[PDB]
């Protein structure tokens, strides 16, 4: 009996911004005003010109393997 | 009895924004004018000009293999 | 008995946005003008000029193998 | 101008198991056997004899009212 | 100009289980007997003879009023 | 101008198990018996006889008031 299994494969992910060029990129003029505003419960507030933004909760990688010989 | 299986494959995930050009992209101006404005329960905001975002959950990657030999 | 067989695969996904060209794009101008507004609930509020959203919750990738040999 | 007006409403909601009577209620012998099972996936298992179960994920109740008198 | 609106309304949610009798309940035998078992992703498992069980995730309650007088 | 509005309302959620009787409820005899068992992820599990379970993540309350007088 001569049990000799190969695994040589790939397991791979490519997840989010990879590989982009951005040449130039101009963000405009931004302008905000804000006069006699009432808040009773949370604020959360996000003021920009030019943004890049990536999470990526995925992209998880799992790899199970079982073996048995029995005689 | 000769066990000689190979994996030799390839298991992927490109999730995204990838490869991709971008050439002078120009955001616009932006104005944005709050007056007298009541808010009674969560406020979330955002006020931008030019924006890239990728969020990803996804891509994820999963691989099971079984090998049993029994005599 | 000889068990060789040979995995030689590719099992890929390419999700979201990708070899994309965007040359020279414009956005606009935006004027947001709110007021005497009353809100009894949660808001979320984007203003912007130009975006590039990619999600992708998907793409995900599963590959099951199972090998027996009995005797 | 008298503005009188009189709200003597009821709204409600009675959701789920009430008011019942289960008089010796007898759940029978329960045998499980479970011998070389092999499983790649979630499992949510359960086991009993007698159960009363009520979810209600309903029931929900919502009154919105306006009075106005402009002049 | 009288403006006495009355409100003496009931704005009610009566949700999961209540006012139920449950006499002399018998919860059977149980005997569960697992042997060789393999299993590769998140198990939740419950064993019991007798259950009682109301999650009640709804019952939610929401009353809005608005009064106006204007002249 | 006389603005003399009355709320003597109710606004009420009753939400879970209330009121009930369970007179003399037995729990059956549970055995469990576990062999040669492999678990390759998170487990959960519960073994009990007799059981009462209340969650209500429900059962919430909100009541807004406005109340305006222009002259």
């Given at each position: 009996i001569?049990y000799?299994?190969?695994?040589?494969?790939?397991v791979?992910?490519?997840?989010?911004?990879l590989?982009?060029?951005?040449?130039?990129?101009?963000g405009?003029?931004?302008?905000?005003?804000?006069?006699?505003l009432?808040?009773?419960?949370?604020?959360?507030?996000?003021?920009?010109?030019?943004?890049?933004?990536?999470?990526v909760?995925?992209?998880?990688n799992?790899?199970?393997?079982?073996?048995?010989?029995?005689?």
């Amino acid at each position: 009996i001569v049990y000799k299994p190969v695994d040589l494969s790939k397991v791979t992910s490519k997840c989010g911004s990879l590989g982009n060029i951005h040449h130039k990129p101009g963000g405009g003029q931004v302008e905000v005003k804000s006069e006699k505003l009432d808040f009773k419960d949370r604020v959360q507030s996000k003021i920009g010109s030019l943004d890049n933004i990536t999470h990526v909760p995925g992209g998880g990688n799992k790899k199970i393997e079982t073996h048995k010989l029995t005689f």
